[PDB]
Amino acid sequence: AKALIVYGSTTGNTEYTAETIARELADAGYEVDSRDAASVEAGGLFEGFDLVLLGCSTWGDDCIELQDDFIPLFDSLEETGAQGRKVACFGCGDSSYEYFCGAVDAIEEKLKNLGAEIVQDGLRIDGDPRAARDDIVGWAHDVRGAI
């Protein structure tokens, strides 16, 4: 099974999340290709992956903004080959803001509308992902099981 994890992370939290997930997946036998959103190109990006996991933290005060590096890919999601793709989303936020992890919701909804198959509800991490390591591993586990 080949997975692609693309993450947008400004202070490295969701990046830490992506790494924890990648390892969980790799320890399970998946081939895992992780990429920083800042570096990727959207066209055909999901092509050949059995599963795509998109990580993005949430910014904004009264307006949901996606982590800066992710925005270009977000805006080009229709160019990735997501139709029919098993995907799951994750991101770091903080529940004291108005839209907790609203970026996870935005990406998921876009995927859903592109016809991707959301295999698991989005992992929304409130606070430092390092304090939620267990939630991350159980989530990585549950997505492998939802495929």
Ligand SMILES: Cc1cc2nc3c(=O)[nH]c(=O)nc-3n(C[C@H](O)[C@H](O)[C@H](O)COP(=O)(O)O)c2cc1C
């Ligand atoms: C000015 C500011 C605005 C933020 N806005 C939101 C928000 O609207 N919703 C949310 O859940 N988290 C919000 N966060 C929390 C960040 O998403 C959180 O710090 C996250 O750990 C950052 O992850 P990063 O390293 O991957 O990019 C905000 C943080 C800051 C400093």
